[PDB]
C-alpha cells in the first residue's frame, strides 16, 4: 500500500465511464435536497470539532499562525497552540462551557496581544489585558505581543542603580539593583506579599522626588490568588496613591488555567513598555509557583508526559523565558530597566523542590522568609544567612554600604555564636556582647507593614545601631528608640545624606553629634 502504488491512482485507469457520467447528473440534485442539514463549509474560518478540558480542537483555520489569538463566536479568546494537519488545538482563555462543537472560530490575525502604553497605568486588567476594574476600556494604549524574546547579551548592561524597597532588612542586607530579578521565596503566610507591597508603596513615595527619568512604574501580577485578596490590594494601592504608577494584572483562583498561565506574560509585556522607552519597571509575579501549577494543568490535559512532581519538561522554560525579560538595557536601547520579583511558595521550608530550584537557577538572588522567624515576631522574617543579592550589591546606596558591612558581619557572628550555645552551659563576656548586639540589630531590622522607610532614614537608623547609641536600651524599646532616633535628629541630616549619597566625614561626626543628643526610651 505504498505511495508509489497510491500515486498511480492520480492518473485515470477506468476506461469505462458508465457510472461517472450517471452520478454526475444526479449528485447536484442529491445535495440540493440536503442543504438545511449542511453547515456551511469552512476553510479560513474554523469550526469546533471537540471542546473539553479547556482545549478546543478546531477544524479549518487554514492560515492561522502558530500561537495567535483566535476568537470563538461566544466572544472567548483562544490561542492556536498546535497546528496539526487536520485540526488546530486551541487553548481557551476563559470558560470552556460556553464553547460547543460546531461553533465558528474566527481568526484575529495576530499573535497574542495585550494593550500596553501609558493608559494601562492605573487599571486592573485580567490575564489578557481586558480591564476588570469597571471604569471603562483601556484608552491611550496599543497592542504588544506577550511572548517577546528577551534582549540578548549585547542589548544589556550591568546593574548599577539601586531599587529601593523601603523594607529595612532588604535594602540593608539583600539590596536590589534596578535591572535585577530577585526571588521572594518562603512558606505560606510568611510576609512574601508584604515585602512586594512595601516595594510598590515605596516607589510611589520616591516618584515625587526624582526627576521623571528615575521613576519606577510598578506592575503587580496576581496569579491564582483569591479575588478578595486582589480587591483588598487594589484598595490599598488606591488609598496610598500607588495606583497612579501601578498596573494590576489579575488572574485569580477561579479563572481558567490558561489565563493564569498567560497573566505573567501579559503583565511582563505591560511592564516592558517602560523598559523599552527608557523608564523603569517593577514587576511582581505573586506566586509564580501558582503559575506553574496552572501550566501543569494545561500540559497534563494536553496529555504531555509528566516529569518530576508531574511537572512538564518545559516548566523551566516557562519561567526562564519570562524572567529573562527583566533586564537593564544598554544606553543605545534607551537605558531602561525592568526588575522582577517572582514569588515562590515553599512547602515546609523545602527549598530543594522542583519549581523552587528552577527559579533559583533563573533569578539573581533570593529573599528567604523563614516560618520560624515569622512566628517569633521578627517581621520581615528575612533568613539572613540564606538571602543573597550579588548583582544588587555594589549597586546599592553608598551610605548604606558603609554601615551594612558591619551589620551583615555582626549578624554573621550572631548566627555563628548562637550556633554554639543557646542554652546556658557557660556564657562568655565576649559572646554575650554578641548576643546583646545581635538581638539589638534584629529588633532594629524588623519593621511594620505598609510604611516603607526612605533610604536616608534607613542608613541613619542602622548607623545608630552598628555603632553605639543603642546599647543602653535592652531589646524591647529599640523599636521605640528608632523613632526616638529618626524624629529627634535634625531633619537636615537626612537631606545631606540623600544628596551626597554617602556619609561624608563632615556629616559623619555631625551625625555622631545628633545621635548623642537624642533621648532614648530605655533609661
Amino acid at each position: 500500500a505504498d505511495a508509489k502504488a497510491l500515486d498511480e491512482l492520480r492518473k485515470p485507469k477506468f476506461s469505462s465511464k458508465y457510472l461517472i457520467q450517471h452520478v454526475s447528473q444526479k449528485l447536484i440534485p442529491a445535495v440540493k435536497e440536503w442543504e438545511k442539514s449542511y453547515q456551511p463549509p469552512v476553510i479560513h474560518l474554523g469550526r469546533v470539532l471537540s471542546v473539553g478540558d479547556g482545549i478546543a480542537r478546531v477544524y479549518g483555520l487554514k492560515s492561522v499562525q502558530a500561537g495567535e489569538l483566535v476568537c470563538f463566536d461566544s466572544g472567548v479568546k483562544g490561542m492556536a497552540l498546535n497546528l496539526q494537519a487536520d485540526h488546530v488545538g486551541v487553548v481557551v482563555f476563559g470558560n470552556d462551557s460556553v464553547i460547543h462543537q460546531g461553533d465558528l472560530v474566527y481568526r484575529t490575525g495576530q499573535i497574542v496581544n495585550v494593550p500596553i502604553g501609558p493608559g494601562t497605568l492605573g487599571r486592573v486588567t485580567d490575564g489578557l489585558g481586558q480591564p476588570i476594574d469597571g471604569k471603562g476600556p483601556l484608552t491611550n494604549v496599543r497592542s504588544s505581543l506577550v511572548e517577546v524574546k528577551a534582549p540578548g547579551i549585547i542589548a544589556r548592561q550591568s546593574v548599577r542603580e539601586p531599587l529601593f524597597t523601603g523594607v529595612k532588612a532588604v535594602d540593608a542586607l539583600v539590596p536590589i539593583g534596578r535591572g535585577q530579578r530577585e526571588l521572594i521565596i518562603g512558606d505560606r503566610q510568611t510576609g512574601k506579599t508584604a515585602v512586594a507591597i512595601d516595594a510598590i508603596i515605596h516607589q510611589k513615595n520616591c516618584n515625587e522626588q526624582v526627576p521623571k527619568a528615575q521613576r519606577v512604574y510598578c506592575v503587580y501580577v496576581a496569579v491564582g490568588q483569591k479575588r478578595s485578596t486582589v480587591a483588598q490590594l487594589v484598595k490599598l494601592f488606591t488609598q496610598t496613591g500607588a495606583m497612579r504608577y501601578t498596573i494590576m494584572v489579575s488572574a485569580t483562583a477561579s479563572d481558567a488555567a490558561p489565563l493564569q498561565f498567560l497573566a505573567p506574560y501579559s503583565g511582563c509585556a505591560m511592564a516592558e513598555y517602560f523598559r523599552d522607552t527608557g523608564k523603569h519597571g517593577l514587576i511582581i509575579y505573586d506566586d509564580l509557583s501558582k503559575q506553574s501549577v496552572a501550566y501543569r494543568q494545561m500540559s497534563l490535559l494536553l496529555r504531555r508526559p509528566p516529569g518530576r512532581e508531574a511537572f512538564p519538561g518545559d516548566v523551566f522554560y516557562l519561567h526562564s523565558r519570562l524572567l529573562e525579560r527583566a533586564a537593564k538595557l544598554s544606553k543605545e536601547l534607551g537605558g531602561g530597566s525592568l526588575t522582577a520579583f517572582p514569588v515562590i511558595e515553599t512547602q515546609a521550608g523545602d527549598v530543594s523542590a522542583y519549581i523552587a530550584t528552577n527559579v533559583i537557577s533563573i533569578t539573581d538572588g533570593q529573599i528567604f522568609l523563614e516560618t520560624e522567624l515569622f512566628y517569633k515576631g521578627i517581621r520581615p522574617a528575612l533568613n539572613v544567612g540564606l538571602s543573597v543579592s550579588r548583582v544588587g550589591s555594589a549597586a546599592q546606596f553608598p551610605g548604606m554600604k558603609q554601615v551594612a558591612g558591619t551589620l551583615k558581619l555582626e549578624l554573621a557572628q550572631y548566627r555563628e555564636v548562637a550556633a554554639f550555645a543557646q542554652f546556658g552551659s557557660d556564657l562568655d563576656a565576649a559572646t554575650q556582647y554578641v548576643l546583646e548586639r545581635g538581638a539589638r540589630l534584629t529588633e532594629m531590622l524588623k519593621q511594620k507593614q505598609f510604611a516603607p522607610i526612605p533610604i536616608e532614614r534607613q542608613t541613619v537608623a542602622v548607623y545608630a545601631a552598628t555603632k553605639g547609641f543603642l546599647d543602653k536600651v535592652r531589646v524591647q524599646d529599640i523599636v521605640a528608640a528608632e523613632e526616638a532616633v529618626i524624629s529627634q535628629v535634625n531633619p537636615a541630616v537626612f537631606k545631606i545624606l540623600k544628596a551626597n549619597g554617602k556619609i561624608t566625614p563632615a556629616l559623619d561626626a555631625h551625625l555622631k553629634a545628633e545621635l548623642r543628643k537624642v533621648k532614648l526610651p530605655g533609661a
Binding site: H44, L45, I154, P211, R308, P312
Partner: protein, 542 residues
C-alpha cells in the same frame, strides 16, 4: 524550485513537520523557512514516513503557518570556525550576536560529527594546577581531561567556573571556548564585558589577538537552540584541536541544559518517556556529545563543564549519566554551603582519576587520602554529636572532630572573582603549599590554633597570620573616645552650610509618558477576519 522545497505541514511548539514533495532531506540537515520574521532554521530530526520530516526549530515558531515554504540547505548547521571567530560571540547557528560585523571564517564546519576513533585517543595524565585547595588536593584536574562541576542551584558552580577561567585560562597559553548553554544572559554579558577589560577579548582591529570565543545559547532561547548550542561550541573547540592542532579550554556552563532541552523536545517527537520523564535516548544523546570533547593525538581539549543537579538529586538520570563521562567530578553540596564553606565542594563525593600515587606522587596522595579518612570518620560521628554532643566522645574521637573541623574550614578559600561581593581578596594557593598545609594538620602541628583561623585563608602561613590577629583582637577592642578626626571644628563645617551646597534638581511633574507614544485606536468590538481575510467585527450569534 518545486521539489526540494517543502512546506510546513504541522507546528507543535518547537517541533515542525515539513512535507517534501520529492527528495527528502537527510536527518540532521538544516532547513530554512521562507517568510519568517527572523531567520528560522530547522534541523531535521526524523523522517516521519509519508514524505514528511520532523524537525526542530532553532528559533521561535510563533508565526508559522501550515503552508510555509521551507528550503533545504543540503547540509547540517554549519558554523564559522577558525581564528577569525576568536573574540566574537556566536549563537547556535553561528550568527554573530555581538554587533561586531560578520565573522570572517577559515572554514564553515558542520556542527555534527562523530567522536574521534579509538586509535585517536591519547592516554596521558599531567596535572592541571588550579590554585584551589580542595580541588588540587582531593580531586586534582587533568590537563587534557574532562572535568565536571556538579551543583544544585545556587551552590556555586558558576563562581567556581569563573574562578577556573581566572586561574587556569590565563596561564594556559592556548585558545578558550566558552559555550554558554542555557544559563543567564546577564552572566553572558558579565563574562563578555569582564573579558574585554581583561584583554582576553580585544575589539576592533586587534580582534585577532583575542584568546576566547563565546558561543551563547542562554535560557531565553527556545529548546531547539539550547539543545544544539553545545554542539556548535564544540565545533569551534574541535577546529582548534583538529586543524590548528593546539590546546583548547572548553568551558561549558550547564551541560544539563542540553539534556533538558532535548527532554522538552522529546515529548513532541512522539516518544515514550523514560525514567523520571526524560527522553529514552538520554545516555546516547549525551554520550554522542561528550565523546567529541576529548584530547586526541593532534590536539587537546581541557573541558570544564558545569552540571546542574535537579532538586539536589544526584541520582537524577541527567546527573547520574554524566558521571561516567568525566575524568574529574567536583561535586558541590548545599549543606557545605550552608556552613559557609566556599567553594562548597563535598570532599567525600568529589573524585578524580588523578588521585593515584603513580600520577601525583605518594606525598600528595597520602595527604589526600588522610584528609578524606578523618573527614569520613567525622561524618560517622555526626549522628552522635547531634544527639549526645561532643561530651560523650572518646578523646581519641575528640581529636578527630577537632582535626576534621579544622581541615573542613581549611578546604575553603576566597576567590578572586568572589571578592567583588564578599570583600575578601582572593588567594591562589600553590600545590606545594596545599600539600604541606594539610599534612601539618593531619600530623598535628596546628592543633594549637582555633578552628576559625583556618576559615577563608590561603595557605598555612596565613592561618598563623589570622590566628595571631584573632588573639590580638580579643585584647584590643575599644578606647576610641576622642582626639580622633571627629572634632567639631577642625575638619567639619556647619551643618546648615552643607544644606546649601546641595545641588537642587528640578522635578518635571508630568511623568513623560506621552512624549513619543502613538495609541492604537482599539475598537469597541472584537475585530476578526472573515472567510476572505477581511478585518470584520465579530458577528452576532453563537
Amino acid at each position: 524550485p518545486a521539489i526540494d522545497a517543502g512546506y510546513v505541514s504541522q507546528v507543535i511548539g518547537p517541533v515542525v513537520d515539513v512535507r517534501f514533495d520529492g527528495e527528502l532531506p537527510s536527518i540532521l540537515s538544516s532547513l530554512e523557512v521562507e517568510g519568517h520574521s527572523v531567520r528560522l532554521v530547522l534541523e531535521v530530526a526524523q523522517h516521519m514516513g509519508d514524505n514528511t520530516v520532523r524537525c526542530i526549530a532553532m528559533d521561535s515558531t510563533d508565526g508559522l503557518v501550515r503552508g510555509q515554504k521551507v528550503v533545504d540547505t543540503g547540509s547540517p548547521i554549519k558554523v564559522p570556525v577558525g581564528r577569525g571567530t576568536l573574540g566574537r560571540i556566536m549563537n547556535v547557528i553561528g550568527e554573530p550576536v555581538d554587533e561586531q560585523g560578520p565573522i570572517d571564517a577559515a572554514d564553515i564546519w558542520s556542527i555534527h560529527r562523530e567522536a574521534p576513533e579509538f586509535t585517536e585517543q591519547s592516554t596521558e595524565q599531567e596535572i592541571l594546577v588550579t590554585g584551589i585547595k580542595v580541588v588540587d588536593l582531593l580531586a586534582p584536574y587533568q590537563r587534557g581531561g574532562k572535568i565536571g562541576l556538579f551543583g544544585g542551584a545556587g551552590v556555586g558552580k558558576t563562581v567556581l567556573i569563573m574562578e577556573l577561567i581566572n586561574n587556569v585560562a590565563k596561564a594556559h597559553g592556548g585558545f578558550s571556548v566558552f559555550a554558554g548553554v542555557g544559563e543567564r544572559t546577564r552572566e553572558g554579558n558579565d563574562l563578555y564585558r569582564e573579558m574585554i577589560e581583561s584583554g582576553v577579548i580585544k575589539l576592533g582591529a586587534e580582534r585577532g589577538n583575542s584568546k576566547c570565543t563565546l558561543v551563547y545559547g542562554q535560557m531565553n532561547e527556545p529548546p531547539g537552540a539550547r539543545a544544539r548550542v553545545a554542539l556548535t561550541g564544540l565545533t569551534v573547540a574541535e577546529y582548534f584541536r583538529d586543524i590548528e592542532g593546539q590546546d583548547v579550554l572548553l568551558f561549558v556552563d550547564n551541560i544539563f541544559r542540553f539534556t533538558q532541552a532535548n527532554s522538552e523536545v522529546s515529548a513532541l517527537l512522539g516518544r515514550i518517556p523514560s525514567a523520571v520523564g526524560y527522553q529514552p535516548t538520554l545516555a546516547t544523546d549525551l554520550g554522542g556529545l561528550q565523546e567529541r570533547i576529548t584530547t586526541t593525538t593532534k590536539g587537546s581539549i581541557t573541558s570544564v563543564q558545569a552540571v546542574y543537579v535537579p532538586a539536589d538529586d544526584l541520582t537524577d538520570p541527567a546527573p547520574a549519566t554524566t558521571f561516567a563521562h568525566l575524568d574529574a567530578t567536583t561535586v558541590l553540596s548545599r549543606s557545605i554551603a550552608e556552613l559557609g564553606i566556599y567553594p562548597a565542594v563535598d570532599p567525600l563525593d568529589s573524585t578524580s582519576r588523578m588521585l593515584n600515587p603513580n600520577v601525583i606522587g605518594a606525598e600528595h596522595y597520602n595527604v589526600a587520602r588522610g584528609v578524606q579518612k578523618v573527614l569520613q570518620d567525622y561524618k560517622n560521628l555526626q549522628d552522635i554529636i547531634a544527639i549526645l554532643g561532643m561530651d560523650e566522645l572518646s578523646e581519641e574521637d575528640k581529636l578527630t572532630v577537632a582535626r576534621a573541623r579544622k581541615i573542613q574550614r581549611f578546604l575553603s578559600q576566597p576567590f578572586q572573582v568572589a571578592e567583588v561581593f564578599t570583600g575578601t581578596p582572593g588567594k591562589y594557593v600553590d600545590l606545594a603549599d596545599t600539600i604541606s598545609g594539610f599534612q601539618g594538620v593531619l600530623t598535628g602541628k596546628y592543633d594549637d590554633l582555633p578552628e576559625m583561623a583556618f576559615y577563608m585563608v590561603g595557605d598555612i602561613k596565613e592561618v598563623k597570620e589570622k590566628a595571631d590577629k584573632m588573639a590580638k583582637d580579643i585584647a584590643s577592642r575599644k578606647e576610641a573616645d576622642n582626639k580622633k578626626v571627629s572634632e567639631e571644628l577642625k575638619d567639619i563645617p556647619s551643618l546648615d552650610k552643607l544644606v546649601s551646597e546641595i545641588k537642587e534638581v528640578v522635578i518635571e511633574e508630568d511623568d513623560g509618558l506621552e512624549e513619543d507614544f502613538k495609541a492604537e485606536a482599539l475598537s469597541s468590538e472584537t475585530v476578526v477576519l472573515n472567510e476572505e481575510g477581511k478585518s470584520v467585527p465579530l458577528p452576532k450569534k453563537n
